[PDB]
RNA sequence: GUAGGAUAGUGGCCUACCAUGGUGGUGACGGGUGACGGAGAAUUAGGGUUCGAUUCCGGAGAGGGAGCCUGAGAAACGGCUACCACAUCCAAGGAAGGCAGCAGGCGCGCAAAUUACCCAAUCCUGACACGGGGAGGUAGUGACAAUAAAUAACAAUACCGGGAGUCUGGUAAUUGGAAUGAGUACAAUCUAAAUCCCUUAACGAGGAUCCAUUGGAGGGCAAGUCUGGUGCCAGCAGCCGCGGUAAUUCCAGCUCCAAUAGCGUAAUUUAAGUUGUUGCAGUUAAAAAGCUCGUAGUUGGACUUUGUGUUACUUUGAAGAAAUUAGAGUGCUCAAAGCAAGCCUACGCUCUGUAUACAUUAGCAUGGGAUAACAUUAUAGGA
């Protein structure tokens, strides 16, 4: 106890931060929101959508 | 005496190759007859208890060593497995699954038990040691 | 395999990159380019592991995709671009300019340059032959092809190349008495005077090099790179100046440093 | 041979419960008393 | 492939070849009780470490004294022994490394030095103090009794700033007793 | 061998014609392998023995064969065609199949985990700074293996020793106040998000039940000629042995011993100078062929300078993957490890470090020419 070590980044402006900073570190500081998604569900949608051709690809439930 | 020549490398190497066969330990591992043993090179084996038998202890001892004829599940060979400890034969029933192990002398008979080279470790998935010490009970009844 | 391998396992990467073995399963696979994959330093290593400008693989891409890094005077956006010996790396925003030279321990060192010295580089001539239409040309060991070279230039010579005019400014003939650097093998990074050339018909040619302190070492012709005519190199060398110290001597310096520092 | 006598003696032996007593120290403490009882103060288990 | 598969690990002790030698059992228990060790394993790893150091010295001594490897690694080995207080500046020869014993290494343990510097009443009291986060070597708290102290660090052994014995607040036993006394 | 054909190209690779060659006790050919090769692993005084499916490199395969398209690259199988073997759906007319990818299931067995989360790190790929990645990482299961390390410390009494006396040491579920993490938990931190660790408010020990186990106590071999039971029975016992009515050996209690968060039981190394090159034996213990000849093999006296014949040997050097091994530097709290870090307190520095050795045999290149091998010599085809 009694001492901690970390790493720090100071950006010239918040605009430069949003360009070079990874998304997860922007959510921690509140500069961005979190889009909730399931990777496995996205994969199953991809495989279901490639059995259909044309504009119906999206409407495939 | 020994061949000593600096150019005698082939003869020395081939002589030792032939003579290693005279060693019983060497020949037992390189003959390939271990695969024909009931365990076929394995440390343990499961089997089915065919019958509960007693074997007369070899002289000068006098006793009835409680064993069990077991047929190995993986190759169908029949062996005699000694059941150790006092009254452990009562924990074994015919047509029961038992784990067998060696008797400790690598396929050689042990003690005064004639022609027995295996012992019973488990019965019905439970170790005889646990049953002997009343740690566990056989799964039935 | 049924074709070309696109991955480089981290333990199979060249040792002079000094990559930690537990840093990951993979190392940057050097792209095709002027230098061989085993004798280069990909830009990702330079920007992230040597200069610390980037903290991750992703940040190196951001730096390069802004067109902020140049190699031999041209912007490069390929993360695994194979920058190699004598290449000039320039970063205008930081006003920095480095030359890739080996330190005496055989590893690439980013030798900071002055703005004046960053306008040229040295190249070793691979061969000279006639091209289409009987036009003579020479190619180097950094993948460059120069047409209409000086008739005096021959194989294994060194040429001074201006990165602006892209022309041969001057050249050094390969001969005994010149100062050379070793670019491969055990003696990589060592500088000395070429003392002898032992030719063996059908076999590799051996060259005996003598250090400034009298230490003599041999190597193959393919690992030699002439740096200057006589005894003065045409390029700035790092602090060691190609002088390889014994481990006993190196330990002596370290002990003294702790007493003073 | 006859298998009816298997477990004979172990069944005849009269049961005797173990006497609960204070446990001994563990680890380093155990090696401490074991060290005082052999260097600081007939075999170890003689029937004296 | 898993990257974790490349992490190295090794063994730190070997068991005796003869398990029931009465002479050895007598000598080992004397060192265990003298230095308050947990078991024979702690003594066996010190013997294992000592064997490694002696083996390195023997190989060097078998080479010519002008051999560069003899000179370089010999100096490093002597420098390593001096930095931990095993050898003396007057014993700067590889032959003196071969004369080291287990007691020399057990005397450099943090447990031994906490006791022989007066901080503890017994070698067994030092053991509990170390593991209970009451000791520090310089600025760092050390709770490993096998910590091998260096000569440059022996003079900085003191109680931790967070300990009741080093300026910190009293532990939870005194605090509860104080609370109970106040309630009365 | 010659001439063609085919191939990205060499080549009996294939065709025509011709020749009769090619390999072999220096083991060809054939057979066995529970045989992928290597880097390496275990054990090692030295020499050695054994292992090497598995994360690095090389090769090979995708149920068994064969064939092929596309393409820079495939004889590709998360591509196609056929046969064979299995097997799914069907409205019985057809149709679709390839987990030795990840997870999961069945089976086989002595024998092996979640049908989880994520592209944040490492890197790869595409038109691409952005998409994708069961590669890879994270967590779950996990006593394979490895590291550190609790289960008490101290004082005063009573009791018991040693150096009448009094200092020191040892015991007690006695009596006292102190210490503390296992646990629990605000919090913060950790992380892609969680979780664990580290840090920390509160809480958390007296029979500190917050109860250490696994094997033993005749010998080998550390520890009982204790007590009860059994009576050549039951059982023990790796080996020698114990048990037949006074059991140190069985079944128990007590006590004691060894290791200790571990310990017992069931291929291989050591011990083995019981495979012997170093380094064993052969009068009688196992072992000189009944005797001699004899080819290959193996081994061969002395002599040449002291005061472009061909090789072995020796010296030095070059080239040589990493990881592992040895080893330099470095206080992850120590350690197994890791490849980091250190310095001061500025908009930073030490060009920070990330050494070095080892690496059979064969091959390459210098120096040496003793020892040794082969070749050679008088009509000199000599200089
Ligand atoms: K031999
Ligand atoms: K290939
Ligand atoms: K061809
Ligand atoms: K031909
Ligand atoms: K293509
Ligand atoms: K990623
Ligand atoms: K990308
Ligand atoms: K010897
Ligand atoms: Mg003789
Ligand atoms: Mg592949
Ligand atoms: Mg050539
Ligand atoms: Mg032809
Ligand atoms: Mg023909
Ligand atoms: Mg093999
Ligand atoms: Mg196979
Ligand atoms: Mg392998
Ligand atoms: Mg196999
Ligand atoms: Mg596997
Ligand atoms: Mg592979
Ligand atoms: Mg294939
Ligand atoms: Mg299959
Ligand atoms: Mg195929
Ligand atoms: Mg598949
Ligand atoms: Mg595939
Ligand atoms: Mg398992
Ligand atoms: Mg406990
Ligand atoms: Mg008993
Ligand atoms: Mg004894
Ligand atoms: Mg009795
Ligand atoms: Mg016994
Ligand atoms: Mg033998
Ligand atoms: Mg003998
Ligand atoms: Mg006879
Ligand atoms: Mg005889
Ligand atoms: Mg002679």
Coordinates of C-alpha atoms in Angstrom, one line a residue, chain C residues 43 68 86 258:
Chain C
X43 CA 7.9 0.7 -39.5
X68 CA 3.5 11.7 -41.3
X86 CA 21.2 3.1 -44.6
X258 CA 27.7 3.4 -11.0

